[PDB]
């Protein structure tokens, strides 16, 4: 094969690889946009869960403040009677039990708050990765355009070298035939009808 045809095969193979690279990045972009959308969905669910468990904590706090209204009066501590002691002991038991339930509602609200912050960070990270893939995909498209333009220019150069090779061989063949026939014609030996 001619050097121009061999050069056109080399650049066509490089353009085929540039196409594969761009296509791989385009599929990566589409799969990464789906992961970002999945992370937005998971973040909206953690946001809802945080609001729900915060409301539950608020409801347990209101149960405490309602029970606190029932606090009995025990001021003569040296002369407490059995009914006043039972009233105070039962009030303290109810306040301690509500406090255990409030501590648990608060532990759960805090975990849900932390899970909402983690899902916000995960959404941010999937969007960061998506924007980086998009920058690489733009890079892939620019390299592919350059490879396409080069493969095309090499193919046209190969075609031009063959058109020129053919024109030159025809021009040399006609020049030799005319040179031979001019010797006869210049000596006055002329052509005649068939």
Author numbering: 62 to 255
Task: Please share excerpts from the published article on this structure.
Here, we use biochemical, biophysical and structural analyses to show how a bacteriocin exploits TolC, a major outer-membrane antibiotic efflux channel in Gram-negative bacteria, to transport itself across the outer membrane of target cells.
Crystallisation screens were focused solely on KlebC51-254 since this construct retained TolC-binding activity (similar to KlebC1-271) whilst removing the putative disordered region at the N-terminus. The lack of density for residues 51–61 suggest that the disorder predicted for the first 50 residues may extend further into the molecule. Using disulphide-by-design, two interhelical disulphide bonds were engineered (L86C, L198C and A107C, Y177C) to lock the helical hairpin in the conformation observed in the crystal structure. In their reduced forms, both L86C, L198C KlebC1-254 and A107C, Y177C KlebC1-254 bound TolC, but in their oxidised states neither protein could bind TolC. These experiments indicate that TolC binding requires the helical hairpin to undergo a gross conformational change from that observed in the crystal structure.
